[PDB]
Amino acid sequence: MRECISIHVGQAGVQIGNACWELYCLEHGIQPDGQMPHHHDSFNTFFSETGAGKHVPRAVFVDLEPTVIDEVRTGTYRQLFHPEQLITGKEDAANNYARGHYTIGKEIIDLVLDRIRKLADQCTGLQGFLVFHSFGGGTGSGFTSLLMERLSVDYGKKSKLEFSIYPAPQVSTAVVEPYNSILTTHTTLEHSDCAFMVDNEAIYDICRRNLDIERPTYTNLNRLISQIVSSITASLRFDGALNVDLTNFQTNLVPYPRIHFPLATYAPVISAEKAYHEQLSVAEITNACFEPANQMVKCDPRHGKYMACCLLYRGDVVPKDVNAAIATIKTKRSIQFVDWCPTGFKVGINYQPPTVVPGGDLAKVQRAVCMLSNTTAIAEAWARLDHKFDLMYAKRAFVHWYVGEGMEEGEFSEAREDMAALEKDYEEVGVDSVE
Amino acid sequence: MREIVHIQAGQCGNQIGAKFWEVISDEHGIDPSGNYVGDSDLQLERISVYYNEASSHKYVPRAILVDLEPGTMDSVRSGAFGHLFRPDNFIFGQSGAGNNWAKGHYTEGAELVDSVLDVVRKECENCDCLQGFQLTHSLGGGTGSGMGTLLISKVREEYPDRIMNTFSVVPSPKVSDTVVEPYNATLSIHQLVENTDETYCIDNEALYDICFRTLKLATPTYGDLNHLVSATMSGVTTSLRFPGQLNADLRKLAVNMVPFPRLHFFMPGFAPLTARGSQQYRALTVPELTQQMFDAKNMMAACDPRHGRYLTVATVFRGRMSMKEVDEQMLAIQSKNSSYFVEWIPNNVKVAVCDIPPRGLKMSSTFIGNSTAIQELFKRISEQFTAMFRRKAFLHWYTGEGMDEMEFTEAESNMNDLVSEYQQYQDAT
Amino acid sequence: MREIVHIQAGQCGNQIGAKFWEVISDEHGIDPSGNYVGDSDLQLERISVYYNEASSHKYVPRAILVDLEPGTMDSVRSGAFGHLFRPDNFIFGQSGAGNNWAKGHYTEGAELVDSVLDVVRKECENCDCLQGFQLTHSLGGGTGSGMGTLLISKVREEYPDRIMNTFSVVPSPKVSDTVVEPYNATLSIHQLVENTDETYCIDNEALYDICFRTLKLATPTYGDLNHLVSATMSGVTTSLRFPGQLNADLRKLAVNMVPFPRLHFFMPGFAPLTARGSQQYRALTVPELTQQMFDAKNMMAACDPRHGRYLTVATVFRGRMSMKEVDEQMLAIQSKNSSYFVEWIPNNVKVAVCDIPPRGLKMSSTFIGNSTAIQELFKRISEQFTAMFRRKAFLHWYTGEGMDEMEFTEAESNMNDLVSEYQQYQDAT
Ligand SMILES: Nc1nc2c(ncn2[C@@H]2O[C@H](COP(=O)(O)OP(=O)(O)OP(=O)(O)O)[C@@H](O)[C@H]2O)c(=O)[nH]1
Ligand SMILES: Nc1nc2c(ncn2[C@@H]2O[C@H](COP(=O)(O)OP(=O)(O)OP(=O)(O)O)[C@@H](O)[C@H]2O)c(=O)[nH]1
Ligand SMILES: Nc1nc2c(ncn2[C@@H]2O[C@H](COP(=O)(O)OP(=O)(O)OP(=O)(O)O)[C@@H](O)[C@H]2O)c(=O)[nH]1
Ligand SMILES: [Mg+2]
Ligand SMILES: [Mg+2]
Ligand SMILES: [Mg+2]
Numbered sequence A: 001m002r003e004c005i006s007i008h009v010g011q012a013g014v015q016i017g018n019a020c021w022e023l024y025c026l027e028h029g030i031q032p033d034g035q036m037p038h039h040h041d042s043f044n045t046f047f048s049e050t051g052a053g054k055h056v057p058r059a060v061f062v063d064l065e066p067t068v069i070d071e072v073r074t075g076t077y078r079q080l081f082h083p084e085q086l087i088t089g090k091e092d093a094a095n096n097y098a099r100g101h102y103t104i105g106k107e108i109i110d111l112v113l114d115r116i117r118k119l120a121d122q123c124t125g126l127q128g129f130l131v132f133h134s135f136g137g138g139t140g141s142g143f144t145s146l147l148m149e150r151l152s153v154d155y156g157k158k159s160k161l162e163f164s165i166y167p168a169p170q171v172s173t174a175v176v177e178p179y180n181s182i183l184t185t186h187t188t189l190e191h192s193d194c195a196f197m198v199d200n201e202a203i204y205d206i207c208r209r210n211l212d213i214e215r216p217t218y219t220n221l222n223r224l225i226s227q228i229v230s231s232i233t234a235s236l237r238f239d240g241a242l243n244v245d246l247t248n249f250q251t252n253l254v255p256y257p258r259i260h261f262p263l264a265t266y267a268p269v270i271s272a273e274k275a276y277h278e279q280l281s282v283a284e285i286t287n288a289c290f291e292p293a294n295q296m297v298k299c300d301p302r303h304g305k306y307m308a309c310c311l312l313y314r315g316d317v318v319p320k321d322v323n324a325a326i327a328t329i330k331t332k333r334s335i336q337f338v339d340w341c342p343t344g345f346k347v348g349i350n351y352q353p354p355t356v357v358p359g360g361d362l363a364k365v366q367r368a369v370c371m372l373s374n375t376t377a378i379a380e381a382w383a384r385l386d387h388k389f390d391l392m393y394a395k396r397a398f399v400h401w402y403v404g405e406g407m408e409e410g411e412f413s414e415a416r417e418d419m420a421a422l423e424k425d426y427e428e429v430g431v432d433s434v435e
Numbered sequence B, C: 001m002r003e004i005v006h007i008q009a010g011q012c013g014n015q016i017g018a019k020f021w022e023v024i025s026d027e028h029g030i031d032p033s034g035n036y037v038g039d040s041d042l043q044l045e046r047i048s049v050y051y052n053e054a055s056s057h058k059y060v061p062r063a064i065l066v067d068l069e070p071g072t073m074d075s076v077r078s079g080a081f082g083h084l085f086r087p088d089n090f091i092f093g094q095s096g097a098g099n100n101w102a103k104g105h106y107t108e109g110a111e112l113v114d115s116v117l118d119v120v121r122k123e124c125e126n127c128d129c130l131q132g133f134q135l136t137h138s139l140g141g142g143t144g145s146g147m148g149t150l151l152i153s154k155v156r157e158e159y160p161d162r163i164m165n166t167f168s169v170v171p172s173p174k175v176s177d178t179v180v181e182p183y184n185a186t187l188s189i190h191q192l193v194e195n196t197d198e199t200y201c202i203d204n205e206a207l208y209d210i211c212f213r214t215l216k217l218a219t220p221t222y223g224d225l226n227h228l229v230s231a232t233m234s235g236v237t238t239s240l241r242f243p244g245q246l247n248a249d250l251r252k253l254a255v256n257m258v259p260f261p262r263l264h265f266f267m268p269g270f271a272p273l274t275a276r277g278s279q280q281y282r283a284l285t286v287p288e289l290t291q292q293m294f295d296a297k298n299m300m301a302a303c304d305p306r307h308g309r310y311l312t313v314a315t316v317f318r319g320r321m322s323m324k325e326v327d328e329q330m331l332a333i334q335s336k337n338s339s340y341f342v343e344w345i346p347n348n349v350k351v352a353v354c355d356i357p358p359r360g361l362k363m364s365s366t367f368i369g370n371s372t373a374i375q376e377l378f379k380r381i382s383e384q385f386t387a388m389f390r391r392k393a394f395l396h397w398y399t400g401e402g403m404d405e406m407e408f409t410e411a412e413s414n415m416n417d418l419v420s421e422y423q424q425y426q427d428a429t
Helices: A010-027 A069-074 A099-103 A109-120 A144-154 A177-188 A200-209 A218-232 A247-253 A282-288 A321-331 A376-394 A399-403 A409-428 B010-028 B071-078 B102-107 B109-126 B143-156 B182-192 B205-214 B223-240 B250-257 B286-293 B323-336 B375-391 B405-423 C010-028 C071-078 C101-107 C109-126 C143-158 C182-195 C205-213 C222-241 C250-257 C286-293 C323-336 C374-391 C405-426
Strands: A003-009 A047-049 A055-057 A059-063 A126-132 A159-163 A194-196 A306-308 A311-315 A347-350 A367-371 B003-009 B051-053 B059-061 B063-067 B130-136 B163-166 B198-200 B310-317 B350-353 B365-371 C003-009 C051-054 C058-061 C063-067 C130-138 C163-169 C198-202 C265-271 C310-317 C350-353 C365-371
Touching: A003 A010, A003 A109, A003 A144, A010 A059, A010 A069, A010 A126, A010 A218, A059 A069, A059 A109, A109 A144, A126 A144, A144 A159, A144 A177, A159 A218, A159 A247, A177 A376, A177 A409, A194 A247, A200 A218, A200 B323, A218 A311, A218 A367, A282 A321, A282 A367, A321 A347, A376 A409, A399 A409, B003 B010, B003 B109, B003 B143, B010 B063, B010 B071, B010 B130, B010 B143, B010 B223, B063 B071, B063 B109, B102 B109, B102 B143, B109 B143, B109 C286, B130 B143, B130 B250, B143 B163, B143 B182, B163 B250, B182 B375, B182 B405, B198 B250, B205 B223, B223 B250, B223 B310, B223 B365, B250 B310, B250 B350, B250 B365, B286 B310, B286 B323, B286 B365, B323 B350, B375 B405, C003 C010, C003 C109, C003 C143, C010 C063, C010 C071, C010 C130, C010 C143, C010 C222, C063 C071, C063 C109, C063 C143, C101 C109, C101 C143, C101 C182, C109 C143, C130 C143, C130 C222, C143 C163, C143 C182, C163 C182, C163 C222, C163 C250, C182 C374, C182 C405, C198 C250, C205 C222, C222 C265, C222 C310, C222 C365, C250 C310, C250 C350, C250 C365, C265 C286, C286 C310, C286 C323, C286 C365, C323 C350, C374 C405
Parallel strands: A003 A059, A003 A126, A126 A159, A159 A194, A311 A347, B003 B063, B003 B130, B130 B163, B163 B198, B310 B350, C003 C063, C003 C130, C130 C163, C163 C198, C198 C265, C310 C350
Antiparallel strands: A047 A055, A311 A367, B051 B059, B310 B365, C051 C058, C265 C365, C310 C365
């Protein structure tokens, strides 16, 4: 009845989605091969149902290099996906925005849109698209910016949520990351509805102290990011005392058309041994999700102000102490709201407790909180990246790879002035308003 | 998919290549007879990148071994592990270049360049999606430095949208293997600077010191020297041959390591390097791997990085590790050692991780740094070339086979121009 | 049904026919004694096209071997695989033609063609439904040239509505086997142009180059040359000898490859040709088969197709393959290689596929090109004849046995007109 399809672009999107679809197949009790062993349907929103008992996901895996898709084709989730959905190219974008947006990615975009149309036409109550893509890659930052220009034309007004991977301040792999991120943000700033940011460095610290682990590989990080994604769409697939649909985030977290960059947060994240010595009440997991050491983006909310918030409880939660805990939080002077937002909280309660995958680092709990806050403190993240771009562009380093692959030197200047206006607007409206 | 073509020119290229295909065959479990004998199925997932499927499940390497004299091909063909190459690829002349650039680029190399190019072209059509070329040669010889340059110019005229690498063995300051070294090296670099995407420069005594104080070897022959180079050569490609957490490829590196079209002379490296006796007293872990490869002692090109600044740096790890440990230390290395990193390139480190450890090791890596200390090598060669050119010594067997004085004076002004721009970016703010 | 009568002339015709019947008997599983020994019945399904049934289930070839000098007949009778030919077909004279067209056309030709025509008529009336004739000879000798010309003329007179192929060994440009080649070559080519249907020109120097370079043979001999020629001929005939997905016949080939009545001089070629040692390093497939087919070095006529344009091309495959691959590669070859294809003949490629691979091979292919490079051969022969006739050498030994200079002038004029028309149609828009 209510359908939403997910698009995974690049290696970051495919690897994250490889762990996300392992979670949905477990919540709904779906075997890895598609068969079956709050519920009356549940899987109808994500799993299209075929003639037999097999369910296939509404996913479109796309990549330019073939070195990662064949891992999915060979791995344990081989019989699940529709073989025609997994689209692969010949050679990657090689961390180049021009290659994955002008020359190489243009020979595959027409095939991808054919699969999207063949998926949207089969469903009736399509809500919106979920895009899992990185920011520093070539096909995860230059090709996903080609999809929005095409999806926003075929489908006029639909919610288009994103789950990006912000480049961390210190820990970073690419060398031309400031070049790819600035160009992507300037182009996707008009064809996106709500872009959630997640940082790789912040999750390293969260998984180190709270979970008490020493070797957090990329499999551990992707297993934790997927929990936030499943928590957002928990009300679509399950009943609850106070439901929240996908369109609710658009009209509650986006005061202005350009300020649509919330940062996710999850709680509680505790190990198996630490779970026995904790009461795990509603009044403290709300406190745990508000501390500055539990945010999943490397920025401190104390420097900024909270424009809006959104808490999505689930499990054994009573709607009374939720109000009591939230009222206490506002009174505390550690957090502060903006003057023109007298009310800045949106709550949602679900009836399905979070599930735990076998062999997972997290332990089984009966309550969970996923907090998505749109705060001014993210303006310091744009300033840091805007400084890196201006440092390399002054000496015109690495430019010759972009110019000779289907771009002009004037495009780099336009993408710079746009980010200067967005940064200015993020503090002009966040400052006190006279009279 | 994304297969590459291997071209070996000269004597050093044939000797390095003869040890290069020993490592690749062992990695993929390929018997010397040419038929697969391995156990794990991950090896055969991507075998077309280097090998070529033939009839009756036989694998033939995609290599083109060529040299002007027939002395070298006798050893590889008649010796062991010479039963798997295709006899068509064995291209050779009758008289060697005689350590002359003119005899390998105009006179004798012009006879063979039309026969090898008919095999390079044939190999490309059978290829599904060509990725690039690989050339191993020397900058001091006659055919490796003269004719290997000729192949570069002709290939670049037919496949402009391709990426090729040269694993040159640049001469050494302390000892000269040939008396007329600077004439050949200067004339080759003037051509390698125009038709090559990245070049890995390797010295010879810098490999002797590594084999002496680190590997603890008393009499290192050329068998134990080419084995150390081949490991570095096989570490760059392994990202696109095996699945990994953070993959890379040949084109991905060229974007990160080459800020400007002329600054593509790299300095490779390897780790861990330990003696056989003293391998039980060390814990194989990421924190010591990064510490070992970042010191001037363990570098395969005899140029101390302390005299310059790293423009960009790559680190292609292997084995199985944790992404947190890898990214935690390269921040510590950058923060603790911020003195020799360029300021106008924030975050000048590229890191990739594979999942298949090398044969007989828990983990390893490979270090590729586009440092500025390479400047001190081109300064020395241009100094030696100037001294000989003024007295016109040895010059009259280069003019007697096509070349002239005007050609020399343009191959040295270009060399000095590169040095000037290689230093103005070290002190640039 | 569709019987074919084979006629062999001269020493070259006799030797090529001996090799050809060796190949045909091996293909059809016929014992040298003349009785069936094979296993599959597909060989027996159509055996009357070449062989002829005889009492006690014997099979006798439908060949008529004839030559003036008895040495070749004695050799073929005394040697192995001479116990199956019919002795009546063994026709010979006493004194050879002595490399004289006049002697081979006006002196011994009379009685020899009387007897040969008697035998030919008897064989044809014994045949059920005649398909065509085959004649293998040389344009340089006396008896072969002149008497094959006389046989062709008489057979054309007797059976106007019939096809005949001529396999002619054209003289070489580099080294001449006989001093007076051009006179015989010019007269024979004039008569053939007058009254033949299709002609496959084959050279000896081109065959020697093919055997030395591609086959990698140190001592190429007439046995190997005749083996190659016989393989080409068997590949031509197999289309109607055996069933296939897309059958073709001699009339089909003539219709598709002869656009004008005076243009029927084709260039043959065979694939694959590989050395014994280097046969297990190649993947036998249609791509590489066509690639080996469509290169000048693999051409059996000493004419470089790059000097002309392919008027028409025919390709007879064998073995089991895919029509999708065959047509896709034909389209790719035509698109990439359009420059040397005639513009006013769109779709200038004929393709036929059989279903029985040759002995000891997965698949093969025979290529027959009607091109415009024969113009150079005709021009060279005409120039040599013009010089020799202008100085009036060796001519009183053609005048002393019936002929006169009028015939030579007419033949030269016809040759010049043919070459001029060939060039003018090559250069047409
Ligand atoms: N959280 C998380 N991030 C990842 C993972 N894999 C890769 N990344 C991020 O992705 C970045 C690399 O850029 P990508 O967009 O993945 O590059 P790509 O998808 O291979 O496309 P190309 O740039 O053309 O090679 C790295 O900086 C990582 O931070 C993962 O498994 N989990
Ligand atoms: N690393 C390494 N270098 C070698 C080896 N063998 C030779 N070399 C180097 O290669 C150079 C030899 O010059 P080449 O380019 O091979 O000359 P060539 O192939 O013999 O042909 P000519 O120049 O005509 O003599 C020497 O200066 C050595 O420094 C080897 O086994 N390992
Ligand atoms: N391809 C090939 N050509 C041959 C072979 N043997 C002879 N020839 C060619 O055939 C020619 C022989 O001339 P023939 O027509 O047979 O003349 P003849 O039978 O000797 O009798 P005369 O014409 O009187 O000289 C030579 O010029 C050779 O070029 C052979 O075994 N293979
Ligand atoms: Mg990629
Ligand atoms: Mg040599
Ligand atoms: Mg004779």
